[PDB]
Amino acid sequence: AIEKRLASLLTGQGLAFRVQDASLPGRPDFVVDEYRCVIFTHGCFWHHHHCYLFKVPATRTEFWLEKIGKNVERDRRDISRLQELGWRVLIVWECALRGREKLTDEALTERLEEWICGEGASAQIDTQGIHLLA
DNA sequence: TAGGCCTGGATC
DNA sequence: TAGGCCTGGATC
Ligand SMILES: [Zn+2]
């Protein structure tokens, strides 16, 4: 749905990858054995991305803010386990794969490349670049 | 299909 | 992690 926009590039570089595995925490979306790393395509809302696509609903605010918080909490945990199992994690938010700021289809491959292969601490890819996971 | 709203939903 | 609605475009 958005997983594709990114998935399409993966095979674009051949990169050996499996999909949505429920045997790995946070059930990654893309799993790559070619580097012992997993990727995530998190929607900006459910996971509270401090990006333009995040808007606290005006209804049942407290019910959504608390539900969301538990999500972030679950990601933190998820990532942490993955890292424990010798996995490198990368998060690519939607705000940088769909929307009025979405990385030009170039910048991605160009950024995914320097990552996936050329090693590097876990990190996240957003509309304004890629930074250490944190 | 482009995004912009509005809510929960289905599962496990 | 949505799907249902509604707008406004590009493709044909
Ligand atoms: Zn975002």
Tab-separated table of all heavy atoms in Angstrom, chain A residues 45-46 57 59-60 64 67 98-99 102, chain B residues 2-10 12:
chain	number	residue	atom	x	y	z
A	45	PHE	N	0.788	8.119	11.970
A	45	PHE	CA	-0.187	8.337	13.038
A	45	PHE	C	-0.149	7.372	14.217
A	45	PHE	O	-0.035	7.785	15.372
A	45	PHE	CB	-1.603	8.313	12.472
A	45	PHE	CG	-2.672	8.424	13.516
A	45	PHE	CD1	-2.644	9.451	14.451
A	45	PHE	CD2	-3.735	7.524	13.545
A	45	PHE	CE1	-3.666	9.584	15.404
A	45	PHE	CE2	-4.765	7.644	14.493
A	45	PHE	CZ	-4.730	8.676	15.422
A	46	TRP	N	-0.289	6.089	13.914
A	46	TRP	CA	-0.284	5.068	14.940
A	46	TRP	C	0.971	5.129	15.790
A	46	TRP	O	0.930	4.752	16.950
A	46	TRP	CB	-0.351	3.669	14.332
A	46	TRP	CG	-1.452	3.433	13.398
A	46	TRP	CD1	-1.344	2.980	12.128
A	46	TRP	CD2	-2.846	3.625	13.643
A	46	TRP	NE1	-2.592	2.877	11.550
A	46	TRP	CE2	-3.531	3.269	12.460
A	46	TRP	CE3	-3.585	4.062	14.743
A	46	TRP	CZ2	-4.913	3.340	12.345
A	46	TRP	CZ3	-4.971	4.134	14.626
A	46	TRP	CH2	-5.617	3.774	13.433
A	57	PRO	N	-6.423	13.503	17.429
A	57	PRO	CA	-7.845	13.594	17.099
A	57	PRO	C	-8.540	14.504	18.129
A	57	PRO	O	-8.033	14.686	19.241
A	57	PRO	CB	-8.307	12.140	17.183
A	57	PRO	CG	-7.087	11.375	16.810
A	57	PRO	CD	-6.006	12.098	17.572
A	59	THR	N	-11.575	13.943	19.161
A	59	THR	CA	-12.606	13.151	19.773
A	59	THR	C	-11.885	12.099	20.577
A	59	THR	O	-10.846	11.604	20.155
A	59	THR	CB	-13.475	12.517	18.703
A	59	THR	OG1	-14.171	13.556	18.023
A	59	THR	CG2	-14.480	11.573	19.297
A	60	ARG	N	-12.406	11.784	21.753
A	60	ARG	CA	-11.783	10.773	22.589
A	60	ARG	C	-10.251	10.949	22.607
A	60	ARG	O	-9.496	9.962	22.611
A	60	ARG	CB	-12.146	9.390	22.052
A	60	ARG	CG	-13.633	9.197	21.808
A	60	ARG	CD	-13.946	7.805	21.278
A	60	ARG	NE	-13.245	6.786	22.055
A	60	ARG	CZ	-13.203	5.495	21.745
A	60	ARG	NH1	-13.830	5.035	20.671
A	60	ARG	NH2	-12.499	4.664	22.495
A	64	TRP	N	-7.072	8.143	22.345
A	64	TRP	CA	-6.133	7.952	21.262
A	64	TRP	C	-4.699	8.197	21.687
A	64	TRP	O	-3.792	7.490	21.255
A	64	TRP	CB	-6.475	8.868	20.120
A	64	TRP	CG	-7.596	8.390	19.341
A	64	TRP	CD1	-8.859	8.883	19.338
A	64	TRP	CD2	-7.556	7.367	18.356
A	64	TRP	NE1	-9.614	8.236	18.395
A	64	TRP	CE2	-8.834	7.298	17.777
A	64	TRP	CE3	-6.559	6.503	17.902
A	64	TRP	CZ2	-9.142	6.400	16.763
A	64	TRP	CZ3	-6.859	5.611	16.895
A	64	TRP	CH2	-8.136	5.565	16.335
A	67	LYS	N	-3.644	5.130	23.588
A	67	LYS	CA	-3.485	3.985	22.696
A	67	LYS	C	-2.210	4.158	21.882
A	67	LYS	O	-1.468	3.213	21.679
A	67	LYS	CB	-4.672	3.882	21.760
A	67	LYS	CG	-4.598	2.805	20.723
A	67	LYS	CD	-5.604	3.134	19.628
A	67	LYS	CE	-5.812	2.007	18.650
A	67	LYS	NZ	-6.608	0.876	19.237
A	98	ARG	N	5.129	8.926	0.905
A	98	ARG	CA	3.800	9.289	0.424
A	98	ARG	C	3.551	10.685	1.006
A	98	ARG	O	3.984	10.965	2.118
A	98	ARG	CB	2.765	8.291	0.956
A	98	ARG	CG	1.317	8.732	0.793
A	98	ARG	CD	0.402	8.147	1.891
A	98	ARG	NE	-0.699	9.064	2.195
A	98	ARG	CZ	-0.542	10.271	2.744
A	98	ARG	NH1	0.669	10.715	3.062
A	98	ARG	NH2	-1.594	11.052	2.960
A	99	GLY	N	2.890	11.566	0.256
A	99	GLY	CA	2.630	12.907	0.765
A	99	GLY	C	3.456	14.036	0.160
A	99	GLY	O	4.415	13.797	-0.570
A	102	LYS	N	7.379	13.790	0.532
A	102	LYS	CA	7.932	12.480	0.273
A	102	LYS	C	9.209	12.528	-0.534
A	102	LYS	O	9.259	13.145	-1.592
A	102	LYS	CB	6.903	11.635	-0.461
A	102	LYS	CG	6.358	12.257	-1.717
A	102	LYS	CD	5.274	11.365	-2.288
A	102	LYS	CE	4.578	11.998	-3.476
A	102	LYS	NZ	3.461	11.127	-3.940
B	2	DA	P	-1.471	8.964	-6.792
B	2	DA	OP1	-0.294	9.405	-7.592
B	2	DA	OP2	-1.275	8.082	-5.611
B	2	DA	O5'	-2.298	10.246	-6.317
B	2	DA	C5'	-1.923	11.548	-6.758
B	2	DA	C4'	-2.097	12.569	-5.655
B	2	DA	O4'	-3.464	13.041	-5.558
B	2	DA	C3'	-1.676	12.161	-4.247
B	2	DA	O3'	-0.906	13.231	-3.681
B	2	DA	C2'	-3.008	11.993	-3.526
B	2	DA	C1'	-3.904	13.021	-4.208
B	2	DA	N9	-5.342	12.727	-4.218
B	2	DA	C8	-6.390	13.622	-4.202
B	2	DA	N7	-7.575	13.052	-4.244
B	2	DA	C5	-7.283	11.696	-4.290
B	2	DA	C6	-8.100	10.570	-4.362
B	2	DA	N6	-9.421	10.634	-4.404
B	2	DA	N1	-7.508	9.357	-4.396
B	2	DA	C2	-6.168	9.304	-4.368
B	2	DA	N3	-5.286	10.302	-4.308
B	2	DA	C4	-5.917	11.482	-4.269
B	3	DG	P	0.412	12.903	-2.816
B	3	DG	OP1	1.472	13.922	-3.080
B	3	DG	OP2	0.711	11.460	-3.017
B	3	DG	O5'	-0.108	13.084	-1.326
B	3	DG	C5'	-1.459	12.771	-1.020
B	3	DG	C4'	-2.263	14.039	-0.873
B	3	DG	O4'	-3.572	13.821	-1.439
B	3	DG	C3'	-2.506	14.423	0.580
B	3	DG	O3'	-2.642	15.833	0.732
B	3	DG	C2'	-3.787	13.684	0.912
B	3	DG	C1'	-4.545	13.723	-0.412
B	3	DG	N9	-5.338	12.523	-0.661
B	3	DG	C8	-4.885	11.232	-0.807
B	3	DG	N7	-5.851	10.367	-0.968
B	3	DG	C5	-7.008	11.137	-0.938
B	3	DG	C6	-8.372	10.758	-1.054
B	3	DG	O6	-8.841	9.629	-1.214
B	3	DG	N1	-9.219	11.858	-0.961
B	3	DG	C2	-8.802	13.165	-0.788
B	3	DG	N2	-9.761	14.108	-0.719
B	3	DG	N3	-7.535	13.525	-0.686
B	3	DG	C4	-6.703	12.470	-0.764
B	4	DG	P	-2.355	16.503	2.163
B	4	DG	OP1	-1.370	17.611	2.012
B	4	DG	OP2	-2.077	15.386	3.099
B	4	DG	O5'	-3.757	17.133	2.569
B	4	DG	C5'	-4.960	16.452	2.268
B	4	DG	C4'	-6.108	17.091	3.005
B	4	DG	O4'	-7.302	16.400	2.586
B	4	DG	C3'	-6.035	16.896	4.515
B	4	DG	O3'	-6.682	17.956	5.228
B	4	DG	C2'	-6.733	15.566	4.713
B	4	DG	C1'	-7.782	15.553	3.610
B	4	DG	N9	-7.876	14.218	3.050
B	4	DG	C8	-6.826	13.458	2.613
B	4	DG	N7	-7.180	12.252	2.271
B	4	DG	C5	-8.551	12.228	2.466
B	4	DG	C6	-9.475	11.188	2.270
B	4	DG	O6	-9.256	10.038	1.888
B	4	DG	N1	-10.769	11.585	2.570
B	4	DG	C2	-11.125	12.830	3.016
B	4	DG	N2	-12.436	13.021	3.254
B	4	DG	N3	-10.261	13.818	3.214
B	4	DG	C4	-9.000	13.445	2.920
B	5	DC	P	-7.198	17.702	6.738
B	5	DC	OP1	-7.787	18.969	7.264
B	5	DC	OP2	-6.124	17.004	7.504
B	5	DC	O5'	-8.383	16.659	6.564
B	5	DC	C5'	-8.832	15.926	7.672
B	5	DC	C4'	-10.334	15.976	7.750
B	5	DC	O4'	-10.827	15.076	6.721
B	5	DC	C3'	-10.783	15.362	9.066
B	5	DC	O3'	-11.929	15.931	9.683
B	5	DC	C2'	-10.942	13.894	8.749
B	5	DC	C1'	-11.364	13.885	7.294
B	5	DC	N1	-10.713	12.737	6.660
B	5	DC	C2	-11.466	11.584	6.395
B	5	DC	O2	-12.691	11.609	6.599
B	5	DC	N3	-10.839	10.481	5.923
B	5	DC	C4	-9.527	10.512	5.696
B	5	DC	N4	-8.940	9.406	5.249
B	5	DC	C5	-8.746	11.689	5.917
B	5	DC	C6	-9.376	12.769	6.388
B	6	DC	N1	-11.822	10.012	10.058
B	6	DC	C2	-11.770	8.733	9.563
B	6	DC	N3	-10.546	8.348	9.075
B	6	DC	C4	-9.405	9.113	9.031
B	6	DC	C5	-9.517	10.456	9.549
B	6	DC	C6	-10.714	10.840	10.025
B	6	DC	O2	-12.737	7.998	9.563
B	6	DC	N4	-8.266	8.615	8.529
B	6	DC	C1'	-13.119	10.426	10.660
B	6	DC	C2'	-13.055	11.228	11.951
B	6	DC	C3'	-14.352	12.019	11.898
B	6	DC	C4'	-14.494	12.318	10.407
B	6	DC	O4'	-13.837	11.217	9.726
B	6	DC	O3'	-15.476	11.280	12.399
B	6	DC	C5'	-13.822	13.620	10.030
B	6	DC	O5'	-12.741	13.918	10.921
B	6	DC	P	-12.316	15.435	11.165
B	6	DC	OP1	-13.526	16.173	11.602
B	6	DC	OP2	-11.084	15.474	12.003
B	7	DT	P	-15.597	10.992	13.984
B	7	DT	OP1	-16.642	9.945	14.170
B	7	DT	OP2	-15.703	12.287	14.721
B	7	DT	O5'	-14.173	10.377	14.345
B	7	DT	C5'	-14.038	9.366	15.334
B	7	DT	C4'	-14.440	8.025	14.765
B	7	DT	O4'	-13.747	7.776	13.515
B	7	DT	C3'	-14.096	6.868	15.690
B	7	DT	O3'	-15.193	5.963	15.821
B	7	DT	C2'	-12.844	6.254	15.086
B	7	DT	C1'	-12.835	6.688	13.625
B	7	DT	N1	-11.509	7.202	13.249
B	7	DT	C2	-10.711	6.486	12.383
B	7	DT	O2	-11.064	5.440	11.858
B	7	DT	N3	-9.469	7.047	12.157
B	7	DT	C4	-8.974	8.227	12.703
B	7	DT	O4	-7.841	8.605	12.429
B	7	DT	C5	-9.879	8.927	13.586
B	7	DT	C7	-9.440	10.206	14.222
B	7	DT	C6	-11.081	8.391	13.803
B	8	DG	P	-15.796	5.670	17.286
B	8	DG	OP1	-17.238	5.322	17.173
B	8	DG	OP2	-15.374	6.810	18.158
B	8	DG	O5'	-15.006	4.369	17.739
B	8	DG	C5'	-13.664	4.190	17.328
B	8	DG	C4'	-13.626	3.361	16.071
B	8	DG	O4'	-12.297	3.517	15.506
B	8	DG	C3'	-13.824	1.873	16.359
B	8	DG	O3'	-14.713	1.183	15.474
B	8	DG	C2'	-12.437	1.288	16.209
B	8	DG	C1'	-11.712	2.254	15.285
B	8	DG	N9	-10.313	2.299	15.697
B	8	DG	C8	-9.805	2.756	16.887
B	8	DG	N7	-8.544	2.457	17.048
B	8	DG	C5	-8.195	1.817	15.873
B	8	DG	C6	-6.965	1.266	15.465
B	8	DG	O6	-5.897	1.219	16.079
B	8	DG	N1	-7.052	0.722	14.191
B	8	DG	C2	-8.179	0.714	13.408
B	8	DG	N2	-8.062	0.143	12.211
B	8	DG	N3	-9.331	1.229	13.778
B	8	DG	C4	-9.267	1.756	15.013
B	9	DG	P	-14.745	-0.434	15.516
B	9	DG	OP1	-15.945	-0.977	14.831
B	9	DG	OP2	-14.485	-0.816	16.930
B	9	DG	O5'	-13.456	-0.836	14.666
B	9	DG	C5'	-13.339	-0.457	13.293
B	9	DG	C4'	-12.883	-1.640	12.475
B	9	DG	O4'	-11.427	-1.691	12.505
B	9	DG	C3'	-13.358	-2.924	13.149
B	9	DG	O3'	-13.675	-3.984	12.256
B	9	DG	C2'	-12.212	-3.269	14.075
B	9	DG	C1'	-10.983	-2.778	13.312
B	9	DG	N9	-9.963	-2.303	14.250
B	9	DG	C8	-10.196	-1.616	15.419
B	9	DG	N7	-9.125	-1.469	16.150
B	9	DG	C5	-8.113	-2.054	15.404
B	9	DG	C6	-6.738	-2.205	15.695
B	9	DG	O6	-6.126	-1.847	16.699
B	9	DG	N1	-6.061	-2.851	14.671
B	9	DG	C2	-6.634	-3.295	13.509
B	9	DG	N2	-5.805	-3.886	12.631
B	9	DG	N3	-7.926	-3.167	13.223
B	9	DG	C4	-8.601	-2.543	14.212
B	10	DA	P	-14.047	-5.430	12.856
B	10	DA	OP1	-15.213	-5.966	12.120
B	10	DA	OP2	-14.118	-5.301	14.327
B	10	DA	O5'	-12.765	-6.289	12.470
B	10	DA	C5'	-12.116	-6.058	11.221
B	10	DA	C4'	-10.929	-6.978	11.050
B	10	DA	O4'	-9.826	-6.504	11.864
B	10	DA	C3'	-11.217	-8.396	11.538
B	10	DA	O3'	-10.461	-9.352	10.777
B	10	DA	C2'	-10.804	-8.332	12.998
B	10	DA	C1'	-9.601	-7.395	12.947
B	10	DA	N9	-9.378	-6.612	14.165
B	10	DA	C8	-10.314	-5.990	14.958
B	10	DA	N7	-9.815	-5.452	16.043
B	10	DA	C5	-8.455	-5.711	15.947
B	10	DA	C6	-7.380	-5.405	16.789
B	10	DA	N6	-7.512	-4.759	17.944
B	10	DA	N1	-6.148	-5.795	16.403
B	10	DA	C2	-6.020	-6.458	15.243
B	10	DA	N3	-6.961	-6.813	14.365
B	10	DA	C4	-8.170	-6.406	14.785
B	12	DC	P	-5.404	-14.085	13.353
B	12	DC	OP1	-4.330	-14.475	12.394
B	12	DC	OP2	-6.584	-14.977	13.524
B	12	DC	O5'	-4.729	-13.812	14.777
B	12	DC	C5'	-3.653	-12.872	14.903
B	12	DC	C4'	-2.918	-13.060	16.212
B	12	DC	O4'	-3.603	-12.346	17.269
B	12	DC	C3'	-2.884	-14.518	16.673
B	12	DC	O3'	-1.786	-14.741	17.567
B	12	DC	C2'	-4.162	-14.633	17.490
B	12	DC	C1'	-4.201	-13.272	18.165
B	12	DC	N1	-5.506	-12.740	18.593
B	12	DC	C2	-5.557	-12.005	19.783
B	12	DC	O2	-4.508	-11.839	20.425
B	12	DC	N3	-6.737	-11.498	20.203
B	12	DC	C4	-7.839	-11.700	19.482
B	12	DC	N4	-8.977	-11.176	19.933
B	12	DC	C5	-7.821	-12.448	18.265
B	12	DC	C6	-6.642	-12.947	17.862
